[PDB]
Design a protein around this ligand. Structure first.
Ligand SMILES: Cc1cc2nc3c(=O)[nH]c(=O)nc-3n(C[C@H](O)[C@H](O)[C@H](O)COP(=O)(O)OP(=O)(O)OC[C@H]3O[C@@H](n4cnc5c(N)ncnc54)[C@H](O)[C@@H]3O)c2cc1C
Ligand SMILES: Cc1cc2nc3c(=O)[nH]c(=O)nc-3n(C[C@H](O)[C@H](O)[C@H](O)COP(=O)(O)OP(=O)(O)OC[C@H]3O[C@@H](n4cnc5c(N)ncnc54)[C@H](O)[C@@H]3O)c2cc1C
Ligand SMILES: COc1ccc2[nH]c(I)c(CCNC(C)=O)c2c1
Ligand SMILES: COc1ccc2[nH]c(I)c(CCNC(C)=O)c2c1
Ligand SMILES: [Cl-]
Ligand SMILES: [Cl-]
Ligand SMILES: [Zn+2]
Ligand SMILES: [Zn+2]
Lengths: 230, 230
């Protein structure tokens, strides 16, 4: 309670394991008295493409379109498309942002990659300078709650996929820490589709139980050593 | 020559540095006598979202939508949407696939992430016995030609962004190698917007020159060691 949470959710099916993890987060955080908002990207038909339709005012350089330059200016002038503005309001108000999604090619599904590309624009999430520890979303927490097709054993240093932390780098360091977020430890629910029903219920319960004490957690040291070792 | 190349290109502006790199690749490979095709994703308004519209006709299980299962079955039953199958035909016929794009959040822009998510489906790009070395696109070459906002020095082990090889992992190993591609060394054009015109013409020239002998190259060893060294 006394906290606002935004859950950015990326799954097409309400009945899925991801849907259950999203619902258990809403239920638990709601029970605690926290304020909770969910951006259900597929239900919103959220636009993932970074295009000139994202700026509604006069372009800074109409001869040669530069998405980053134009969205930075549009943010400052308040001429960004309203879908982007609506998400920035949710992020601005949130104390914790949880991303709930199935891993697609060792990363986030494209609809959620689009949310990162379009919502986290210069001027809003970072500035030059004003990134990493000085990012604009400093003071906020972020957490990746990911599900995988591959097993935990495949995601180890000696497994075929390498350690799970390796693929977290672009997201935790390159994106969240770059924008100033303090990153909480990822929640990784391995291979639910081939797990037993008891194991799945167990993974949902472990997430619910973790959320009970989420506000007492410290963030991870978002560094190369944490992700890669040595 | 006697080779087919597909360039999957993700930039909004034809006059951009990315546009120039795409154009010299088409020019050089066409001069060599190679068969060249370009999927200009923004011009195609390529759909990035993984949804049930990707399957035509009746769904395998219309009570609980599972994208991976539905697209695997649709691939086997020849019922995938035409935008996806049009791209799969280009890939199937290609000997080399070059991805040309600006780095967005240490990864590919969402429209290109969408192409990977939707085009590289089970049955087409990978299957139970076929992945990594036995991936279904084995025999084909793939190459990432990336442009960055950050300077090369920022992309060093002690630079703020970390070694560039760190962010290449989900793309080169988790995606390309996983599908069976032999991965050629990435072409990284660091910070073209900050560079002088000479340094830029210099980077465009290095790319054109490299393409002259591209078929003489051996692929990189796509391992955790190559990426995280040490
Ligand atoms: C394009 C694409 C790319 C991919 N790339 C990767 C990759 O790089 N790496 C990788 O490892 N995987 C990858 N995958 C696999 C993907 O990560 C998994 O398919 C996904 O994580 C599974 O989560 P889900 O919610 O879709 O599962 P579900 O299909 O929902 O499976 C979970 C099962 O649990 C049941 N269930 C739901 N709620 C509950 C509950 N509360 N209690 C008990 N049971 C419940 C469901 O009915 C279901 O049978 C990819 C998939 C696609 C489509
Ligand atoms: C959403 C988003 C996320 C981003 N995330 C990251 C990130 O994680 N890491 C990072 O490092 N960067 C990031 N960036 C920055 C991005 O990677 C760079 O802006 C992009 O790579 C620059 O390439 P460009 O083609 O857009 O450049 P341009 O704007 O085209 O700059 C090159 C200059 O050269 C000119 N030019 C074009 N062709 C030629 C030619 N043949 N010869 C000479 N000059 C020529 C152009 O007109 C231009 O002035 C991000 C940007 C956005 C919008
Ligand atoms: C890098 O790893 C990837 C990449 C793409 C993938 N698309 C699907 I569907 C899966 C899950 C199938 N594997 C298992 C073990 O269940 C998958 C895994
Ligand atoms: C991790 O690094 C990122 C992340 C997101 C970014 N969005 C933009 I626009 C940039 C270019 C900013 N300039 C430099 C030199 O980096 C950018 C860089
Ligand atoms: Cl598999
Ligand atoms: Cl040679
Ligand atoms: Zn970090
Ligand atoms: Zn590899």
């Amino acid at each position: 309670a006394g906290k606002k949470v935004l859950i950015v959710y990326a799954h097409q099916e309400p009945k899925s394991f991801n849907g259950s993890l999203k619902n258990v987060a809403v239920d638990e955080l709601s029970r605690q008295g926290c304020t909770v908002t969910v951006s259900d990207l597929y239900a919103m038909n959220f636009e993932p493409r970074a295009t000139d339709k994202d700026i509604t005012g006069t372009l800074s350089n109409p001869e040669v379109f530069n998405y980053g330059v134009e969205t930075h200016e549009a943010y400052k002038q308040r001429s960004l498309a309203s879908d982007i503005t609506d998400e920035q309001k949710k992020v601005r108000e949130a104390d914790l942002v949880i991303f709930q999604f199935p891993l697609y090619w060792f990363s986030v599904p494209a609809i959620l990659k689009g949310w990162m590309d379009r919502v986290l624009c210069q001027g809003f999430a970072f500035d030059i300078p004003g990134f990493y520890d000085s990012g604009l979303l400093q003071g906020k927490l972020a957490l990746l709650s990911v599900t995988t097709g591959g097993t935990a054993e495949m995601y180890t240093k000696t497994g075929v996929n390498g350690d799970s932390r390796y693929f977290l780098w672009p997201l935790q360091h390159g994106t969240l820490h770059f924008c100033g977020f303090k990153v909480l430890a990822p929640q990784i629910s391995f291979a639910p589709e081939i797990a037993s029903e008891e194991e799945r219920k167990g993974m949902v319960a472990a997430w619910s139980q973790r959320l009970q004490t989420i506000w007492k957690e410290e963030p991870i040291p978002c560094t190369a050593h944490w992700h890669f070792g040595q």
